[PDB]
């Protein structure tokens, strides 16, 4: 919840070596190490409002990890263990940002 603390908000591309405890439709309890290749986006890097919107969430690392973990777990919950392992990366990556484009 609160382990690291730094004066700077890292905007450059990075990752989170997070592990989740998900459960598929076959109830198969498996933990799985995630990365969350992330980067902050600013279209106008001088506007005070947008720039201060960076510090909106004070625990953005945890927010990103929890949101992706929740959505991943919810989507793998609808598939069997066989499906979650055949299309492992496929279903987890569509789990994070489920749409059709």
């Amino acid at each position: 919840p609160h382990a690291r603390r730094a004066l700077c908000l890292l905007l450059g591309p990075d990752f989170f070596t997070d592990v989740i405890t998900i459960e598929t439709a076959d109830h198969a309890r498996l933990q799985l190490q995630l990365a969350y290749n992330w980067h902050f986006e600013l279209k106008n890097r001088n506007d005070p409002a947008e720039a201060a919107k960076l510090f909106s969430v004070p625990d953005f690392v945890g927010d990103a990890c929890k949101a992706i973990a929740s959505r991943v777990r919810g989507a793998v919950a609808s598939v069997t263990f066989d499906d979650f392992h055949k299309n492992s990366a496929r279903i987890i990556r569509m789990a994070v940002f489920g749409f059709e484009m």
Binding site: A25, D26, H27, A28, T80, F81, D82
Partner: protein
């Protein structure tokens, strides 16, 4: 149970594909037994002519 069902399903499908290879094998096994007996009888013609 919900993972053993997956194991059973994949092993059953592989058993069916193994039977596929076995049955296709036996299938042209028959035909090639057949075609070699064809040639054998073709010249058993000369056998029994001259015998």
């Amino acid at each position: 149970l919900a993972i053993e069902i997956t194991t059973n399903s994949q092993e059953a499908a592989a058993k069916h594909e193994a039977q596929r290879l076995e049955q296709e094998a036996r299938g042209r096994l028959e035909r090639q037994k057949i075609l070699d007996q064809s040639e054998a009888e073709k010249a058993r013609k000369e056998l029994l002519e001259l015998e």
